[PDB]
Amino acid sequence: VNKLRCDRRPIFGKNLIDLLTKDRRVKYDKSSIIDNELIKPLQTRVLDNRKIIDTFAVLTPSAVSLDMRKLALGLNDDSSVGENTRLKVMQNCFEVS
């Protein structure tokens, strides 16, 4: 136990976890501007273009092979991954929007 404790101690963060956030920390305040309405990120553009997407999307992947998606992602009934880990993965995919 002495050897294990002595060996488990010298685990050093290579740079830090506080250096990272101290260099992220921007002294510039919130300074809210019309940039919120000026940026319009990708998700907003996807959301507000519903009509065009609905009207102009036609083609389908005429040839498909079901159950290939699960195999490609490495999660299925039998694989090299643990059952609990894969279950957590599918749960996260279920709850991610």
């Binding site: 002595c6 101690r9 010298p10 685990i11 963060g13 976890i17 506080d18």
Partner: protein, 49 residues
Amino acid sequence: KLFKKNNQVNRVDLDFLNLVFTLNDKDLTSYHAEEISKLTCVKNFVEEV
């Protein structure tokens, strides 16, 4: 399965020996690491022994 023949006879975890330090920065800070290195519980096992 055929390739998973016992390797623990001739394998090293390589994380117990702190050779994968590249992920230590995700959760540990510098001052806490320095303190935990300074506050080792050594010399107590020697006393008990």
